[PDB]
Design a protein around this ligand. Sequence first.
Ligand SMILES: Nc1ncnc2c1ncn2[C@@H]1O[C@H](COP(=O)(O)OP(=O)(O)NP(=O)(O)O)[C@@H](O)[C@H]1O
Ligand SMILES: Nc1ncnc2c1ncn2[C@@H]1O[C@H](COP(=O)(O)OP(=O)(O)NP(=O)(O)O)[C@@H](O)[C@H]1O
Ligand SMILES: O=C(O)CCCCCC(=O)O
Ligand SMILES: O=C(O)CCCCCC(=O)O
Ligand SMILES: [Mg+2]
Ligand SMILES: [Mg+2]
Ligand SMILES: [Mg+2]
Ligand SMILES: [Mg+2]
Lengths: 253, 252
Amino acid sequence: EETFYSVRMRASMNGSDGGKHISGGERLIPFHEMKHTVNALLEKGLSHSRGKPDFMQIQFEEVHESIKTIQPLPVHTNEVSCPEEGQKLARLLLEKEGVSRDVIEKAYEQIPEWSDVRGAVLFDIHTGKRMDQTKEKGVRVSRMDWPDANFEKWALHSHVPAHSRIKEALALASKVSRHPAVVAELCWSDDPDYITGYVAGKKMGYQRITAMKEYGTEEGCRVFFIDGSNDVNTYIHDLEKQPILIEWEEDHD
Amino acid sequence: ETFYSVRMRASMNGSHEDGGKHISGGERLIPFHEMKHTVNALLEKGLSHSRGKPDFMQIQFEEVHESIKTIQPLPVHTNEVSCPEEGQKLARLLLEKEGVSRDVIEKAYEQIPEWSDVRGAVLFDIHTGKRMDQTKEKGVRVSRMDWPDANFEKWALHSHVPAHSRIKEALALASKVSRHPAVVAELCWSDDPDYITGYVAGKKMGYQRITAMKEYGTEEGCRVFFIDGSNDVNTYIHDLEKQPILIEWEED
Ligand SMILES: Nc1ncnc2c1ncn2[C@@H]1O[C@H](COP(=O)(O)OP(=O)(O)NP(=O)(O)O)[C@@H](O)[C@H]1O
Ligand SMILES: Nc1ncnc2c1ncn2[C@@H]1O[C@H](COP(=O)(O)OP(=O)(O)NP(=O)(O)O)[C@@H](O)[C@H]1O
Ligand SMILES: O=C(O)CCCCCC(=O)O
Ligand SMILES: O=C(O)CCCCCC(=O)O
Ligand SMILES: [Mg+2]
Ligand SMILES: [Mg+2]
Ligand SMILES: [Mg+2]
Ligand SMILES: [Mg+2]
């Protein structure tokens, strides 16, 4: 049983304090990867297209819970020609996954107000309302990662480019989708220079959508559509604390 | 040309907040273009410590918005002693020379064992003869001071003192702290098992190094500031944490 470490970073400008969120990252690693990983997070925060931070934290801590290893979701890339086509597709896919249309519309009305949320919003498909009480902080999924070497192999097989963005997103989405209360996830970047997003779920897998907004805009989105009776805090604790490594099995081909 | 405060702390068996053992701490004050090197120096300092390997560490940077003040290091004298009991006695003599009363010194020495787990400094009020800050195990952590290596190395050459980073860090801290008009004296020795030199610092005597202050292999250090002031302790804590200082020595 190898010991793993959670390594987290966040960065902002104009303070920590009301600042603009610039970058966030999370990694899960053995101890001999610490120097490289702390540097990868530092650099990710310092070279961000949302601007240069005046505040950054980086932390590591031993994880005591035993690590679980899962397969990435099956990926499909939907090529679209503009953001409106993408968004419409996204809403079709959410519906097919099981989110009712009226819940989807209600959430889409609120997505603009959630632009500044630094993690994810949790949206209850029973009440048709936001379920977490974290406000601008959002719920930040942590303690997931995907050893690069296995990711590069996966991307080669999948005919998807071996970009860090995709490794991070797919690791997140896979951890999130595994959770029995999560029906679906809608995501696109708050970076001005990346317009691909996705909808994920247990059935459809990870459905990339190649245009979800316009170049140059900084309004991203991360919403988890939740179907659960249980207390939201239990779900939040799972998302924040349950350690996941992604390992794609070439062999299962 | 804006400066950044870069701070680190590390502990084992948890964060310090959960009751982990403090391993290492550091603070630097740097232009933005030195950030990578500095974050790497702090990471490495935390990971290679003689008190053991951390399982928790935080590193943070923020822009400093107060103006930087540049000062001289204190004058340094090295007192050679044969053993830790001789050094401790000398330290008490020097605290008294610096203006601390014997009764306050004894009361502090009674409490020093209690403060072994404090990760920063204890503030000791000479008017009450008791601890003054309410930070408990966190202590007060002096930050936002630093000393460009090139100038420090010149200083160490001139001073016939080795150019060790421990000394640079300590003398930078002690100079910032002694400048504060409400600090009468500082008493220090290391919590590192493999370093037994400590010091007493003040405005009259400068930085008085004492070559043995404890036994090799012990992990009980000490950092106490003796306070004689008219203000509330929160103001002094804010001064020590926030006032940015660079050391620049120039010969006489
Ligand atoms: N670990 C996470 N948990 C919850 N939501 C997140 C997480 N990472 C990103 N998000 C959300 O999804 C949006 C887009 O993600 P992303 O573009 O990766 O931003 P980021 O991870 O905050 N910083 P960066 O990856 O440096 O661009 C973010 O603005 C958050 O709202
Ligand atoms: N910046 C500071 N402010 C207040 N107290 C400090 C400061 N740095 C160290 N001390 C205290 O003085 C003791 C010895 O100093 P030192 O040996 O430098 O410890 P350190 O800075 O915490 N870690 P390291 O420097 O990596 O050994 C520490 O155990 C602290 O209690
Ligand atoms: O990392 C980002 O910028 C936000 C999520 C986008 C990743 C989607 C992908 O290319 O599959
Ligand atoms: O860094 C430490 O371990 C504390 C040492 C304080 C004395 C340094 C010196 O003057 O030798
Ligand atoms: Mg990200
Ligand atoms: Mg982003
Ligand atoms: Mg130190
Ligand atoms: Mg020490």
